[PDB]
Amino acid sequence: MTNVLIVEDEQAIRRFLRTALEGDGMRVFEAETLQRGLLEAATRKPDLIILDLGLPDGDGIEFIRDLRQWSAVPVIVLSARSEESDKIAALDAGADDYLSKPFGIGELQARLRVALRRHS
Amino acid sequence: TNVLIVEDEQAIRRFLRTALEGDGMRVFEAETLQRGLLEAATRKPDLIILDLGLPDGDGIEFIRDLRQWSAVPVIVLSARSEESDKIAALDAGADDYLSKPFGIGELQARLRVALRRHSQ
Numbered sequence: 001m002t003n004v005l006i007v008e009d010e011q012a013i014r015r016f017l018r019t020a021l022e023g024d025g026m027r028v029f030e031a032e033t034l035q036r037g038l039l040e041a042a043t044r045k046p047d048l049i050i051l052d053l054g055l056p057d058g059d060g061i062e063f064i065r066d067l068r069q070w071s072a073v074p075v076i077v078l079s080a081r082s083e084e085s086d087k088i089a090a091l092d093a094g095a096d097d098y099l100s101k102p103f104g105i106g107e108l109q110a111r112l113r114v115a116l117r118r119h120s
Numbered sequence: 121t122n123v124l125i126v127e128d129e130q131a132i133r134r135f136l137r138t139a140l141e142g143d144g145m146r147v148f149e150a151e152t153l154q155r156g157l158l159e160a161a162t163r164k165p166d167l168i169i170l171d172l173g174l175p176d177g178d179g180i181e182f183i184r185d186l187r188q189w190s191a192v193p194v195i196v197l198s199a200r201s202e203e204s205d206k207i208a209a210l211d212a213g214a215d216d217y218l219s220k221p222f223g224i225g226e227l228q229a230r231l232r233v234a235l236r237r238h239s240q
């Protein structure tokens with residue numbers, strides 16, 4: 001199936017995304033830290049990464065910076081921040097999309113499809 | 121790089137042209153859906169910024185038609201901001217969607233994502 005990795009410390013968000021993506025027939029992998037997410041990214045061959053930017057071991061922009069040295073996998077970022085400067089930095093660092101919370105699952109799903117079609 | 125702006129409102133169309141020319145791009149304009157599609161086919165733009173509220177139809181019709189013959193990235197503008205708005209346009213084939221009002225800096229970062237991904 002399509003493999004999606006979620007990198008997010010916040011347990012409720014992880015569970016919420018996993019249930020939504022599994023129900024659309026995707027295989028979901030999870031990591032709770034930036035460092036573990038990078039390990040899983042290299043391990044699991046995700047077709048897409050949904051990355052929360054507020055992680056306990058660093059700003060998620062550092063995940064993108066590291067990841068982009070060795071992977072072109074699509075990345076959709078999530079943030080509690082709506083600040084324009086944050087959106088610009090994350091996209092310019094290599095994110096493919098950015099959704100500020102709160103957001104609807106339906107929009108996330110549509111944006112997931114764009115990111116997956118384009119790489120197909 | 122060539123950008124096609126499909127937008128009947130003169131003010132925002134001019135604002136976008138001068139913003140994008142300021143980053144060194146060449147700008148083409150169209151103020152109806154039909155002329156937009158024709159410009160898109162003849163000028164081979166690297167991207168299209170599409171307003172959904174045109175005098176001769178819904179820009180979703182523009183997108184559906186375009187996508188039979190072109191993979192050029194399309195970023196939609198619209199005053200429409202409901203989630204269902206965004207889902208319909210993305211599913212039709214748009215690459216991104218920004219509701220108005222928006223920050224120019226955010227639009228430009230989103231244009232760059234589309235550029236690097238369609239140069240791959």
Ligand SMILES: [Ca+2]
Binds near residue numbers: 052053055
């Ligand atoms: Ca978090």
Ligand SMILES: [Ca+2]
Binds near residue numbers: 127129171172
């Ligand atoms: Ca209009």
